[PDB]
Amino acid sequence: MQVWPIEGIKKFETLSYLPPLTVEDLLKQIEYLLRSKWVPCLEFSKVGFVYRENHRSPGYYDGRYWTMWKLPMFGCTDATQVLKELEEAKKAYPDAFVRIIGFDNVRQVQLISFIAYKPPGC
Amino acid sequence: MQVWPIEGIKKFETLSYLPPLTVEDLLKQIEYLLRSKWVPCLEFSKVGFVYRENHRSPGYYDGRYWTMWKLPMFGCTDATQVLKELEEAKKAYPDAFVRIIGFDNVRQVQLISFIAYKPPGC
Amino acid sequence: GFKAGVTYYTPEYETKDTDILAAFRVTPQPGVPPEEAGAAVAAESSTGTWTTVWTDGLTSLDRYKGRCYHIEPVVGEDNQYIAYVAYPLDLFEEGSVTNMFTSIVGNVFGFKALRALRLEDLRIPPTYSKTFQGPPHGIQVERDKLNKYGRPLLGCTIKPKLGLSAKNYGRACYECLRGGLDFTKDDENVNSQPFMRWRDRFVFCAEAIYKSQAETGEIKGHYLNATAGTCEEMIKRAVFARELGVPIVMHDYLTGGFTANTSLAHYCRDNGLLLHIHRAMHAVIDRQKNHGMHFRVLAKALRMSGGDHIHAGTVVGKEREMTLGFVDLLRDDFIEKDRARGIFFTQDWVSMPGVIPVASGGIHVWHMPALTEIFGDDSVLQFGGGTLGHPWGNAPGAAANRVALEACVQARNEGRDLAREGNEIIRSACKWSPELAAACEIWK
Amino acid sequence: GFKAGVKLTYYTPEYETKDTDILAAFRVTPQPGVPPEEAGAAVAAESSTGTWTTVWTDGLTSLDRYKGRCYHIEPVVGEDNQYIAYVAYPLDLFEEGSVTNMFTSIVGNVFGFKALRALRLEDLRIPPTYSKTFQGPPHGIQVERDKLNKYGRPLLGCTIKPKLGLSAKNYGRACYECLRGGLDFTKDDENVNSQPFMRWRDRFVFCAEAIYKSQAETGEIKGHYLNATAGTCEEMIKRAVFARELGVPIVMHDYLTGGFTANTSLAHYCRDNGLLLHIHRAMHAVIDRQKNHGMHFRVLAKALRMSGGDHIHAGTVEREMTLGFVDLLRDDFIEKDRARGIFFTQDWVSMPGVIPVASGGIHVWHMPALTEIFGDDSVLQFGGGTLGHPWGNAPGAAANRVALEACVQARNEGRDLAREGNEIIRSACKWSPELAAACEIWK
Amino acid sequence: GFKAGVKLTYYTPEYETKDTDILAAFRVTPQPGVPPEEAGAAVAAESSTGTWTTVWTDGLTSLDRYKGRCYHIEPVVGEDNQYIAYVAYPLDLFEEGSVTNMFTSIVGNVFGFKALRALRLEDLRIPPTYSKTFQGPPHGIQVERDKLNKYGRPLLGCTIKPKLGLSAKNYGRACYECLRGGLDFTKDDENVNSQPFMRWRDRFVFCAEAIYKSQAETGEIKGHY
Amino acid sequence: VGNVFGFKALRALRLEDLRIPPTYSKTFQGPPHGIQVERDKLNKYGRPLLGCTIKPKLGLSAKNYGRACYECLRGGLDFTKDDENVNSQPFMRWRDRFVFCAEAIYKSQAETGEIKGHY
Amino acid sequence: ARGIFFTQDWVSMPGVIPVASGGIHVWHMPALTEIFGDDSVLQFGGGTLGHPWGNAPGAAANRVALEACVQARNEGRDLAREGNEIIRSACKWSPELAAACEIWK
């Protein structure tokens, strides 16, 4: 019988329970986005999880929004371009978590979000 | 006249005002659980006391629940087996508090809880 | 056929599972046979009338009459008998202890043919008890809420009851709680008075509760007395306790009354507050063996009206059997008839939660073994002078009691006989606990 | 210094009571081997600041200002072990306006002290300084007479029977017939609250129709004591509220079984809404029957006057003792009188009085005696005495009303009701067929 | 000991019903090949504590205290595949005063079980210990007769038609004429709540005028549902 | 469906579908939030949500019930759930269950960093 | 053919998330994911509380199985045909899932 860890295993929703995603793994997830005609975008934060500082009413949480890295990559047709931006973000903010999200103009909502980089020690 | 300490003496309910329990002392308390036909279970936490972060309404407290070490030892008839698990917990989590709890399926409630291990600075 | 002019003793009657049964200790007046005494008890506590009334012809009386179905001599007494009476379920208002008491003991005790009368027990049928909320929480829920298991709970009753400022009162509370006690308590007389108004007491006691809780890491509480002159005031006090987020409030159920107590019990259920019940004034009613109401009846009534804790005496010494009897009636789900313990009827509570019995009085550390053995873990032991009287103060006094208790618990769990090794268990604990050693020297 | 653990302080024979002290007279029966001074002394300590071991917190205040004091002890003529211990309690011990606290403070603990074999609270001296913190009766004797426009005679009522078993409508029918015959009120039994087959709201509706039908027929104001006694305060008030909506004049409460906290709340509601409040003393005998232990009814009576009530049951016809507490219930100033069980001079400083109510197995032949004993300021309840008349409720009510007025007329003329009672009733029988019929059945 | 998981705990023909149990009579039609005993067990299991895989949390309490149990199965005369399965449910499973919970607890899940081709709840034995937690009728037969002062005959009413299409006033007119002729009540169709052309408050106003006009005319108490 | 299913001329009747016109549906609030709003509120995207229905449905104390919830949530499930039969009953009254389940929700949420809930 | 007898227009009224429940476990994850897609809730009662290592490991097993299915689907794999392989492959790096798969195969 094995005990599930209580620390060092904090999560970032979808795909964060799989082993660390390799560059190839990430590329395929990004390609899924482009194939589905969704717009990829990078987001980063030095705080990786939700909290409740300003209110505790139903549905209210702080820390859901992170910061946008530049703008959504509209018209992107090369998944490699997204990786390029991820590398730039990591270079500028090596101490920040970076996730890849996706927007769909047809459904008119954000509909994808997965962690792509975690700072050393996080 | 002697003054009761204000620090370094935080408690863990039943039996925590007694001197540190020896291995022999611990086995006797476990056997009591077994003779009483109750099910022993280990619980651990890196936070040893109660607090009120999410609410302050009557009867609500955070920190009452700790994390379960594996599962309740149903059918256990050897107090030594409980000791074995306590040692594994201490080895896996030397910086966490570990307590032994008990459940009774007749009264249908948890009915035992005493500290069994405190780190090297608590 | 009317007939103006000037039916209750039925030994052939078979009780219904919906009947409320009563066991009355009756002392007939001279020249009054016990059979006549029994009928009077039943008639005067139900449909009996001195003269014939034509309105009886508009309904079916044998459907609403109380019936004395059995009478037996009292062991030892020469003119005392136990008369058993059955009352139809339809006579009682659902969820009202006030009506149950009014219906059964509201009139019969003043009947001329009865020199003396005492209600010993009541068989509350499930069909009637299910119409009551009962304890706001009950034994098991309380232990889970406070995260306390495997030992009696400990509390200190603050003294002097009257005379301290709200702040000095709260200071005493903090010191008691930080030393190891689970609760501190307001005296039954402490409501709101000149020099110590209730809201000020609530504020300082709340500060004390939280200061001690933060220091020790264990959940603490103070029985904040909400007993008041009016229901509006009583609720007002419970409301502020709720705002403060404290775990428990208190009520003197007999002096405040059942209508008010039930209202308070409902409020506590709706707001997650534990309810400590003090039995002030009970001895005015339950002390004499020949007249009144035995405490076990008042205890069942409280469980039905609502309370999480209830004082059960001191039972201290080495009455024991009678106390264990009503303690079971208060805590257990099913209690079999046991005359040796004052249990006249088998009582089935059909899952209504139990109430934690509270032991109090002039008890101290040397009584810990006996108290633990008598009550077991599901009890609250209150030490007033036994804490505030410690030579080193409240915190050390609390520690002495907590240590003495855990020593007894440890010994009992290991299989030792508290009823025989009690003193030795305490003496052994004195070896490593200076606080306990100091307490034992003063009260031995 | 605070040193230690485990009649020298609580027995003060020359203490002079203060006008603000609450005084108590306890009938004490000491255990064998216990001096009466220690007995009376323990009564004081155990009903105040007693403590088995010394506590340092006592040094943070002045306990002598909070202790009860036994200032006098005397034997009860005829007992080798029964005495009356007088105790004085400081005003500061009591919460203003709370009978609940007064009872808790004085009788909440002492009765179980084992050095005492038996204890009975006989009387309490309620100081004006404390009674002025209580509303008292919602209306009181004088206001009630003015509201109902009834003067010069005891009021009359009928307690409906059978208490349980009748439908709300049949119940109301019985009420109408009683009221139309001459009775001022009809009444719910103490046990009648809300039950299967007769729920309270239905009873209130039909009784209201009965009240108004009989009032319109006779031209005299009528009422029915609608019992608001309930399991919770919310329910109790809910019932008083509907009575208010119906516009009826009076409601009822079983003060001891419902409790003082609830009773005080109801008395307040009645004052705020112009409702008279009839108080039934159900369960009092559990406490006040035995001379050796408990609380005498006069204490429970004073407590009710304080908590609030316009009527209060007082018996059925001991004599001297009854006249004593009746005065305590009705008058403004009552001088001490041991012959009538009045242990303390009682000054009510204008708090209204309560109308005493007589009930039980009484009938027309008891009318002269009842009128003589209680006087005009009382209510006489005839349950079987009305519903048991051979001609029905209306004639039964008429018989009682006639018998009463015959007694009142005679008394007013100067006749001795105590000696000419039977002759007064026999004479009335000669012109009242209704009374004659009743007199032949209950002679 | 707790292990993996996977009628063995629900068909108890020896079980003696308790006076506090809620009893149910289910007309069950088993799927082909399903033994009558297995179907009855399934009815009890799937309407109570039956779980597909063993869960260790069951070890924290006493199951036999919360399981519904099929205590009797009777074949239905004339059917080669129909039986009445009787199930007893402990009192503690039900929330006091809640018909919603009683239905949820008994018929909330079992009717969809694949092993049962068809299932029909025929009756329920409501124990006094449970029914006493319910208010029941606001008034009931006897109180109603006393309130309306009507005795010795069935009451009479007319259900207004057309249910929809009349103005509130024309509707009330129809009511008045019915009541004045000798009927005790007039009635709103089950479909008549509040709709375009006849809003509820307007209907209540005109029906009230009709109730009182007819009552004053006849001298008998009138009403409109 | 209020009256027709009982007509004797029909041996059996089943309503299969209803065409709700926009003119009628627009008079209803509809879902308090709906699929998209829920995903945004919980900050969960790209996968089905996961939950565990607590068992045994009846028999556990409110606290033991809550303990089971905490352990389920901390392992990766988004929600834990009350059985349809679990409302308020002897041994597990609703307010006690709410208190303990709330402690479980917040303990697991703080531990994992993901938003948690209990039906 | 799918029981839709009328064209239904909801004119922007929000949708409701469908919930799958019953005797389902890790091996059903691929099928469940393919049938309902992302906008659904999958309830695992016995499928969690029945895991040999307890609730936390049970939850982890279900969360891992689901994300493995989601990942594979996103890459373009056929869940209806490669389901078992997707789960078996995930068992290699997830002891929790491996334990679950051994119990309910």
Ligand SMILES: O=C(O)[C@H](O)[C@@H](O)[C@H](O)[C@H](O)COP(=O)(O)O
């Ligand atoms: O303040 C206190 O210390 C208690 O209230 C005390 O005065 C009381 O005497 C005991 O609790 C026993 O009383 P009972 O046996 O009457 O409960």
Ligand SMILES: O=C(O)[C@H](O)[C@@H](O)[C@H](O)[C@H](O)COP(=O)(O)O
């Ligand atoms: O219902 C009634 O007819 C009365 O309630 C009656 O039962 C009662 O016996 C008398 O009122 C005297 O009672 P007390 O003297 O005890 O008040």
Ligand SMILES: O=C(O)[C@H](O)[C@@H](O)[C@H](O)[C@H](O)COP(=O)(O)O
């Ligand atoms: O407690 C549970 O585990 C569920 O509530 C379960 O008992 C129910 O059978 C499924 O939810 C499917 O039922 P339906 O398909 O009928 O919804």
Ligand SMILES: [Mg+2]
């Ligand atoms: Mg006290």
Ligand SMILES: [Mg+2]
């Ligand atoms: Mg009466």
Ligand SMILES: [Mg+2]
């Ligand atoms: Mg219709």
Ligand SMILES: [Mg+2]
């Ligand atoms: Mg379910």
